[PDB]
Amino acid sequence: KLSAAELRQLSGEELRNKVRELKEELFGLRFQSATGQLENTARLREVRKDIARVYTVLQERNLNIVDDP
């Protein structure tokens, strides 16, 4: 899974929790990469892409491009 437009079915607070969880996962991945672990390197970019998606949804809600749930 890589997240998609179903993030628009979530609420603001749980989307922000999603942001925090994604940031923590990226932190762990970066530490693994530094320490020599993390064979799965593509996730290291996909997590940042997911953060971008969640910020996209939040900003469209904030700017009223899409009606806020």
Place this chain on the structure above:
RNA sequence: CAAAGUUGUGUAGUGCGAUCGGUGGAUGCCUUGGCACCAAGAGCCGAUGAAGGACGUUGUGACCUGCGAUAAGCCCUGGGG
């Protein structure tokens, strides 16, 4: 055999020719680059912060191109497969 006389000279090197190579990158044939134009556009950008940059950004060392900590990319829409 002696006497008198004649002629000859490449083991150092060199010249010329032929031949076989080396160096060199001319020539010929090209080209992801230029040059001069034609036709149609567009003729402004900027405090909603420009022109141009610095630094950063990739699974990984650099540089170029793109991008800006949402960082060779995020979303919507249409096309295409």
